[PDB]
Design a binder for this molecule. Structure first.
Ligand code: K
Ligand code: K
Ligand code: MG
Ligand code: MG
Ligand code: MG
Ligand code: MG
Ligand code: MG
Ligand code: MG
Ligand code: MG
Ligand code: MG
Ligand code: MG
Lengths: 136, 282, 401, 82, 136
């Protein structure tokens, strides 16, 4: 996600606050601010569209097979939403590299809570509070 | 071969609050300024009658200085491999972001809580508007000495033939040196000009801030583009636990090979007498 | 010309500190190098001892003509100054030390309760930073000091502190440079290689026993089984008398000590660091080929003595101008515009070379000049002091004729 | 927080400049996929470097199969008419 | 919340352990130990009953519009309960400025786990482990 200042486009600093940084291996090429999930032993790939696939957000652009820094739960992050969102909305990985609300998704529970609302295609600020895996 | 070991600066905002107001270095984050009641008129009375008492009464303007903060964190690998000193650059950014914060707190109090207004209604927006706004303060029996100004207001003012024509101004200084002309700080009985930046006022669009009541600007019907006021009757209150002013900490994370710099200051801004101030409106 | 500086000086900061060319954090970093001890601290202490450890002498030109009744008793300005600053040898070493570690030495003037002069009192240099004008002159001093769990901060005018700078960016530099921060990379390189060596000596400096159990391509041995073997061959219980008896399918291999030249790494670190701090390599307890004798030696000791002389001159002038003259002006009956000089002794004089010189050319020196070179009090009789032939030679004639 | 690989930090990294210069000096074409790894392309943002082969010295160097005059290795952008 | 020693009543220190302390604007007047939720962009107000409204507990008393510090979902806290609670009870906001159990609430999941039991109107010790937002 990116901010415009005159001619210039600046990448946004993804991680606002947070003590929870961990290193994984990229299972595919990934870009800064994408939601991701476990796809193999310590291997991390882009989250699909609904629940059960979220470990954190990727902090920098990687080729496949590179080491990846994640911001986990307990982090506040600047993330793009594919939907208009408001404070107190629970949000979830959208499957498109953005987040969307739980209310829009097929799921019943989110991974991050919106602290600062945003329009569709725009950067919200959110706190990651949970991870989701395979429950069947 | 060696790189261009240079970084071009971004936009830098105008910083004036610390000169353009009474600065209190408070001993406590919370406090009070005592205010005396207005002057009255002595009662006419008969011979031998009791003198009825109508003494001084008092109230306070309270301050609650709020901590403004800014910070950054970088990995030690990034410090070591940087083209320029990243810690120095972040120290400068943190200091600037606090000073900008002070100027937002100041300007939002100044613009929102002025008790008088001169509505130009388009029309005579130059010297006549400043003179009129001094007249609005003068009707409340205070007198101003300073004005704070938006870029669009400045642009209008320096197009005014009263300032732009050297014979009408008495000097060609405005035509030559624009806002740096000495007359721009010596006009309508005001002895200070405080040029503000457009982004300074709290629109509530910036993250972590909830907006003021007005629109700071001078391009559309209802914008407030200047404030004419008594510099002794608007207070900026600064509080710091470890000194007098902005404090920057340089620190390492105890366990993660991360270094950061964090800045803080507590600030409030309060009118002593809001009647001593008038906005100019488009 | 003009009475005010008209070139600008690259120094007026944008922020609300006066630019803080060094911050209080950097000053604590110098203090942390100094208090950490070890080889780095000892080298910088040898630098202080060379520059200032040999003590001082006060001179005034026309000192005899200053003779004045101070308190019924007569004194010269030199006598008054020597009473005003009794322990100047310690103060010069202390301030000179600080002004090598930190950008400046700094302090107060102090008075008795009666308001007579007490001392020039140094202040802890890592606690203070100067604030300076558009022509680069210090206008205020900002002080941050530790307190329980935090800091107290205050501001003092330049009016009543004094400060001294040995190392400068320019002749106009009134703020100075820390030689520690100027060479922080070489200090880091030294310290990191020290740690790397220490860890490598533990892992690789000593041979280690490797017992291999079982036949190659034979039956496998499990952890349970190796525990019993470990009990038999345990080094914690072994000695020089110990012998081992085994079947063919037990092998006692050795990880050798894996040689690396840590001595060469230390010598390289010490060469880099001593040269960076301007000391000769010999100060680091490291020797060198073709550098111990002849003109190759004489040059490096000349370079050292020149560096010492330059620092001493820089310190002497500022101490007289910023400390002694104000004290004479404000607490003394003498003229502060008198020609005071503070000399600091050469640490590397050979008195035998001085004695050789006196034997060879004393016939061209006054007895006063000989007493000065020899570091002795000048003769009591001004006639014998002023004369060129020896006082012992005048005595034998004055008695004998 | 910003890591050395984080997108807002890349212009501050000495290596990001040095390896983009390296890539310009080393390419024969703008077609990155045939010349560089996905790792190199992502880490050094090579799409945004003006890579085209025009700054590779070997674009301009004579490399003749039979060299009678001992003239291989000569660089045309050093001729007097350049 | 208050503690008695002899004649004297003392304020209870809300935070027992944890470092996940975060800053918001108060959307109303708030009191120490009170549960709060996001009422606007970086703005928090007192939680209503039965879930979907909890970000943390307010650490000190504040007026409306003041900046407020909040203990988040890694902190261990001293908090007042509207009913008797026991170790291993899950609890969440009452709407009354206190906490009650998931067992008495119409909700099905809590935000804190009780570590030390307490009677109605007393101070329990609890570990905050989740946040709850708008899921629809
Ligand atoms: K969907
Ligand atoms: K209920
Ligand atoms: Mg009060
Ligand atoms: Mg009566
Ligand atoms: Mg009355
Ligand atoms: Mg009025
Ligand atoms: Mg001009
Ligand atoms: Mg077998
Ligand atoms: Mg803990
Ligand atoms: Mg945190
Ligand atoms: Mg947690």
């Amino acid at each position: 996600a990116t901010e415009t200042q005159g001619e210039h486009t600046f990448p946004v600093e993804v991680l606002i606050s947070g003590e929870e940084l961990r290193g994984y291996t990229a299972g595919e090429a990934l870009s800064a601010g994408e939601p991701v999930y476990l796809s193999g032993d310590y291997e991390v790939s882009a989250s699909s569209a609904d629940g059960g696939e979220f470990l954190g957000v990727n902090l920098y652009d990687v080729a496949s097979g590179e080491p990846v820094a994640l911001a986990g739960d307990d982090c506040e992050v600047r993330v793009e939403v594919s939907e208009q969102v408001t404070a107190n909305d629970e949000i979830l990985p959208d499957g498109l590299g953005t987040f969307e609300t739980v209310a829009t998704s097929a799921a019943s529970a989110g991974v991050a809570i919106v602290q600062e609302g945003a329009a569709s295609g725009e950067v919200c600020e959110a706190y990651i509070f949970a991870v989701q895996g395979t429950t069947a | 071969e060696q790189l261009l070991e240079v970084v071009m600066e971004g936009r830098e905002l105008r910083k004036v609050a610390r000169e353009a107001s009474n600065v209190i270095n408070a001993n406590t984050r919370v406090g009070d300024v005592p205010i005396a009641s207005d002057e009255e008129f002595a009662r006419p009375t008969g011979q031998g009658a009791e003198i009825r008492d109508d003494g001084e009464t008092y109230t306070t303007v309270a301050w609650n200085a709020t901590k403004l903060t800014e910070g950054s964190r970088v990995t030690d690998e990034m410090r070591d491999q940087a083209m320029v000193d990243l810690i120095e650059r972040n120290i400068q950014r943190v200091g600037a972001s606090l000073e900008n914060g002070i100027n937002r707190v100041f300007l939002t109090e100044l613009v929102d809580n002025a008790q008088n207004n001169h509505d130009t209604a388009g029309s005579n927006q130059g010297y006549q508007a400043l003179n009129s706004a001094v007249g609005e303060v003068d009707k409340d029996d205070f007198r101003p000495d300073t004005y704070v100004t938006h870029p669009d207001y400045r642009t209008q003012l320096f197009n005014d033939t009263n300032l732009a024509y050297a014979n009408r101004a008495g000097t060609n200084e405005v035509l030559r040196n624009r806002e740096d002309a000495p007359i721009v700080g010596d006009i309508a009985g005001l002895d200070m000009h405080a040029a503000m930046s457009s982004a300074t006022y709290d629109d509530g669009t910036d993250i972590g801030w909830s907006g003021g009541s007005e629109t700071w600007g001078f391009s559309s019907d209802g914008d407030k583009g200047a404030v004419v006021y008594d510099r002794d009757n608007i207070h900026t209150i600064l509080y710091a636990p470890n000194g007098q002013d902005v404090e920057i900490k340089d620190y390492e994370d105890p366990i993660r090979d991360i270094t950061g710099v964090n800045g803080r200051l507590h600030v409030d801004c309060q009118y002593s007498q809001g009647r001593s101030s008038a906005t100019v409106q488009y | 010309a003009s009475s005010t500086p008209q070139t600008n000086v690259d120094s007026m900061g944008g922020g609300q500190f006066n630019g803080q060319d060094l911050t209080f954090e950097d000053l604590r970093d110098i203090k942390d190098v100094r208090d950490s001890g070890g080889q780095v601290a000892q080298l910088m202490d040898y630098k202080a001892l060379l520059n200032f450890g040999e003590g001082c002498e006060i001179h005034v030109e026309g000192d005899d003509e200053t003779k004045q009744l101070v308190d019924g008793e007569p004194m010269t300005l030199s006598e008054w100054l020597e009473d005003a600053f009794p322990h100047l040898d310690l103060l010069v070493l202390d301030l000179g030390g600080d002004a090598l570690w930190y950008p400046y030495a700094v302090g107060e003037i102090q008075e008795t309760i009666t308001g007579e002069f007490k001392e020039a009192l140094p202040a802890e240099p890592w606690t203070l930073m100067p604030e300076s004008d558009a022509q680069g002159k210090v206008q205020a001093w900002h002080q941050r000091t530790k307190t329980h769990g935090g800091y107290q901060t205050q501001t003092l005018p330049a009016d009543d502190l004094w400060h001294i700078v040995i190392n400068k960016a320019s002749a106009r530099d009134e703020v100075g440079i820390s030689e520690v921060l100027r060479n922080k990379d070489e200090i880091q390189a030294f310290k990191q290689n020290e740690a790397a060596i220490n860890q490598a000596i533990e892992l690789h400096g000593f041979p280690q026993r490797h017992v291999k159990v079982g036949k190659e391509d034979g039956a496998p041995v499990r952890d349970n089984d190796l525990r019993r073997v470990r009990t038999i061959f345990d080094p914690r219980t072994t000695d020089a008398n110990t012998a081992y008896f085994t079947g063919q399918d037990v092998d006692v291999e050795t990880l050798e000590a894996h040689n690396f030249d840590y001595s060469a790494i230390h010598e390289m670190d010490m060469r880099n660091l001593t040269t960076a701090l301007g000391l000769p390599l010999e100060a680091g307890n490291v020797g060198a080929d073709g550098l111990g004798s002849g003109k190759p030696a004489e040059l490096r000791f000349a370079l050292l003595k020149l560096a010492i002389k330059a620092n001493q001159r820089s310190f002497s002038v500022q101490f007289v101008e910023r400390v002694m003259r104000p004290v004479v002006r404000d607490y003394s009956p003498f003229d502060h515009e008198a020609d005071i000089r503070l000399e600091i002794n050469d640490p590397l004089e050979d008195i035998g070379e001085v004695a050789d010189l006196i034997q060879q050319v004393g016939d061209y020196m006054t007895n006063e000049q000989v007493a000065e070179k020899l570091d002795l009090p000048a003769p009591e009789d001004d006639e014998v002091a002023d004369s060129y032939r020896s006082p012992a030679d005048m005595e034998k004639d004055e008695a004998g004729v | 927080m910003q890591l050395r690989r984080s997108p807002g930090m890349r212009p501050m990294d000495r290596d990001w400049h040095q390896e983009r210069a390296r890539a310009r000096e080393q390419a024969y074409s703008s077609d990155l996929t045939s010349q560089f790894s996905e790792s190199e392309i992502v880490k050094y943002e090579l799409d945004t470097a003006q890579i085209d082969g025009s700054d590779n010295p070997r674009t301009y160097i004579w490399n003749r199969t039979i060299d009678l005059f001992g003239m291989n290795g000569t660089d045309v952008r050093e001729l007097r008419n350049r």
